[PDB]
Amino acid sequence: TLQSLAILGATGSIGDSTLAIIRQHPNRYRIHALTGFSRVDKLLALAMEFHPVKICTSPDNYAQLSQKVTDAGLDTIILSGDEGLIEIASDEAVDTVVAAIVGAAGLSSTLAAAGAGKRILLANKESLVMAGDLVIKTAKKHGATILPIDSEHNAIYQCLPAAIQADNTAIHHTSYGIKKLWLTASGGSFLDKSIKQMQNASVKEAVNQKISIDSATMMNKGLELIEACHLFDLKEHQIQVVIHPNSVVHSLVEYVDGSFLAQLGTPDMKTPIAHALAYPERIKSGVMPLDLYQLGSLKFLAPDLDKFACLKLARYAARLGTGACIALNTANEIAVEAFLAEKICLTDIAVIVKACLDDKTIAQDYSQDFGDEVLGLERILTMDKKVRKIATAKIKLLKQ
Amino acid sequence: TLQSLAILGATGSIGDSTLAIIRQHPNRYRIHALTGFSRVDKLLALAMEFHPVKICTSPDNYAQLSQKVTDAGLDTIILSGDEGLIEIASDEAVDTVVAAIVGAAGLSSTLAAAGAGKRILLANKESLVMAGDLVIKTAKKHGATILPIDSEHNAIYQCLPAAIQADNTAIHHTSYGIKKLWLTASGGSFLDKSIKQMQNASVKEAVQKISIDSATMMNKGLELIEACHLFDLKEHQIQVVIHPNSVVHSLVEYVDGSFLAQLGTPDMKTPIAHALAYPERIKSGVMPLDLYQLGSLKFLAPDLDKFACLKLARYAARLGTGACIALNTANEIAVEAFLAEKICLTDIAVIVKACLDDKTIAQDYSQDFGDEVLGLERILTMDKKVRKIATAKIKLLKQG
Numbered sequence: 001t002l003q004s005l006a007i008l009g010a011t012g013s014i015g016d017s018t019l020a021i022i023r024q025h026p027n028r029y030r031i032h033a034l035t036g037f038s039r040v041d042k043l044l045a046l047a048m049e050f051h052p053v054k055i056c057t058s059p060d061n062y063a064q065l066s067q068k069v070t071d072a073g074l075d076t077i078i079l080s081g082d083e084g085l086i087e088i089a090s091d092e093a094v095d096t097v098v099a100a101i102v103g104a105a106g107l108s109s110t111l112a113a114a115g116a117g118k119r120i121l122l123a124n125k126e127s128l129v130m131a132g133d134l135v136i137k138t139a140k141k142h143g144a145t146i147l148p149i150d151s152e153h154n155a156i157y158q159c160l161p162a163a164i165q166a167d168n169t170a171i172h173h174t175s176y177g178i179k180k181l182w183l184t185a186s187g188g189s190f191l192d193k194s195i196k197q198m199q200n201a202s203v204k205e206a207v208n209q210k211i212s213i214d215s216a217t218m219m220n221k222g223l224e225l226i227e228a229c230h231l232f233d234l235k236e237h238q239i240q241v242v243i244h245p246n247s248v249v250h251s252l253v254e255y256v257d258g259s260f261l262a263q264l265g266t267p268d269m270k271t272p273i274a275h276a277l278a279y280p281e282r283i284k285s286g287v288m289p290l291d292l293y294q295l296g297s298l299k300f301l302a303p304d305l306d307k308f309a310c311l312k313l314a315r316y317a318a319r320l321g322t323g324a325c326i327a328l329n330t331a332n333e334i335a336v337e338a339f340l341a342e343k344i345c346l347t348d349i350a351v352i353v354k355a356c357l358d359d360k361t362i363a364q365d366y367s368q369d370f371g372d373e374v375l376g377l378e379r380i381l382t383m384d385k386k387v388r389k390i391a392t393a394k395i396k397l398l399k400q
Numbered sequence: 401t402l403q404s405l406a407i408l409g410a411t412g413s414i415g416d417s418t419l420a421i422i423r424q425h426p427n428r429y430r431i432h433a434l435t436g437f438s439r440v441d442k443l444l445a446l447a448m449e450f451h452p453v454k455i456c457t458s459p460d461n462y463a464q465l466s467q468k469v470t471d472a473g474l475d476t477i478i479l480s481g482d483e484g485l486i487e488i489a490s491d492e493a494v495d496t497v498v499a500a501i502v503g504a505a506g507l508s509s510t511l512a513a514a515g516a517g518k519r520i521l522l523a524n525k526e527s528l529v530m531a532g533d534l535v536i537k538t539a540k541k542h543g544a545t546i547l548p549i550d551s552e553h554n555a556i557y558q559c560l561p562a563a564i565q566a567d568n569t570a571i572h573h574t575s576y577g578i579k580k581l582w583l584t585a586s587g588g589s590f591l592d593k594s595i596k597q598m599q600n601a602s603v604k605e606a607v608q609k610i611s612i613d614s615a616t617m618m619n620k621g622l623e624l625i626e627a628c629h630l631f632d633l634k635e636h637q638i639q640v641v642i643h644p645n646s647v648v649h650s651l652v653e654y655v656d657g658s659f660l661a662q663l664g665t666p667d668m669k670t671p672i673a674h675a676l677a678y679p680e681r682i683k684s685g686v687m688p689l690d691l692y693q694l695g696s697l698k699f700l701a702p703d704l705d706k707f708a709c710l711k712l713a714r715y716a717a718r719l720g721t722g723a724c725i726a727l728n729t730a731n732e733i734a735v736e737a738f739l740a741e742k743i744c745l746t747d748i749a750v751i752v753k754a755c756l757d758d759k760t761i762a763q764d765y766s767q768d769f770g771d772e773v774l775g776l777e778r779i780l781t782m783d784k785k786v787r788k789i790a791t792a793k794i795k796l797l798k799q800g
Contacts, residue, residue, distance in 0.1 A: 158658060162562055177681025182691065242691045252663070257677075258670035258686040259558060260663040264651070271657040278656075282577025287657040292582065292641050297696035 009100035011036035056084035085109035132230035133371030147276035154272035155250035155263035222314020236318035323366035331356035409500035411436035456484035485509035532629030533770030547675035554671035555649035555662035621713020635717035708749035730755035
């Protein structure tokens, strides 16, 4: 029963929560490897505590990290760059990979873990936005098990029957009676602000960091919707969004008899991570539990899609397939960076995304099979590079 | 495939919802029998529509019903009384029994269905308050499957893992990680009223046995006892949360911090369809919950100084079945007395507590009310004894 873990992106929030669970349950989990691109001193401290066989950092931090490791008298193998992540994720001594590297940087190690038949605790939604068919097919072919540890998707997973948890395609058997998935969304910091205040928002006002902007625009939720389409083997029409500012209800599953099953909790990521680590069993997580007696009013409302145009664009991209999802994701990234550099305003993010989605040169690639086992990854990366250039040019076209 | 149903207590709310489902799904469900003690014309109208092989009514209404059945041209077998209910519940041609007779009047037919290995859709919580160990043991011995169709308990059942749904005792394996059950309660009509207004409430202001129990929160204390049996727990593992909206129908707290909940509308077709089709799901014909149109959902701690009956239910649960019978029987006699304007609303708890604490009643608490051969007679003996003592306590109170 003891699982050997590799944590890909071990120095942030997911890593903290995962390691805290491991501290509490040494008979079930041990650390084989940890990675961290930027936080050399924290990575070193984790290595001194957990004694991983291997760690990996960025090529630029390799010399520094290796210095510090040898100063501390540690026997650990270092590793750097994309191929170090792949090595760690595919290592025969690893049972379970916690995939918490943000963005496109995480895609090739996630594929390697899938290709090696690992249990994958998935916290890197961009890998499914960019490569969802390829990732899911590869995992299925090699017997890798994907468990979502994002809050919303973990909640949905908990609220589906065991046969559908084990085989996502079973959702299409009518006898299970899944009618719709419901993603909850906090609404972000402009939920109670006008479109005009979005238009005029300063960077300071928008963050309250890529992640905060995506939450401000609701692109975060649109990317989650795409992710859900893959994880749960559904089309976008079968996944609806409800605004829930309290973030107590983490998402819901609607059944054909009228039952809505939901998972509720606090924001502490130990909850979904413990659920996924122990699955199909459950374990103590150490969280301060939700206090039902001390909840404010829980509120729910329809999302305003005229204001949150990114969510609408995500849903269009989902219908068009992986090529359009890559374009959406890549254009959004380049537009967010431009917003942060004060080159465009917040409401112009959707404008750049739409212009890329509709661009005939991009759209000509939508019919490619980005799920192709041999050609898929190169097609995905080629599409990303092409869209990055075009999105940059649209920003200039707009601001000229 | 096709299930043959007997509906015990077919003329009320549960029967209306169940029969509505059967109208929608003739290939899965057919009516073998229907019962109704008091609503002869309605029972006749259902018999004319569904063509049951048997029906049953009270001894007093047998001649009238028999006349009307003859006059309408029907071929049906007419039974009467307790032994007619037992005959219908234990009939070899019946697959599934919907047990919706209110109060003690439902106990012996519920036992007979259990003893005959039927699937039992249980809406008669008093059978488990009075006889829970006996009912559960008998069902286990004979392969009867109990599915709760009361809203709260059905919600809990939906939120438990499949192994615990199939075997209630599996809850005690720590690997499933059940931490607590949470029953939701509307709080009743005096939730926002003072103790003085309860004391002074007229019968008109208070509302029928069921409405009084909701006013006092005894309803919820009886559900708590019911849950102890259905889910094989002690009362301290089952908590109550006030939830006036009644959107959340109950919850299950797991050791990792996850609270799984079932949400829906009040339409009983939802839990009934869930239990009829289990382990599959079916369309119930309900108007589904509209998440976009919810008022805000409120939760709060129950006020146990005001709702003394809930507190007395919990004390009864710790003392065992004998005390639960005493509680249930004293409550019934006290409710009758309130309705006859002999005592005030806040005196219901006073009578119930005096019975629970009575040395003569309490000497019977150590009896095995679960004994297969002696249990039913012990239960009925205890009921009769408490009924006499409670009547005497009411008289002793109208003085001192």
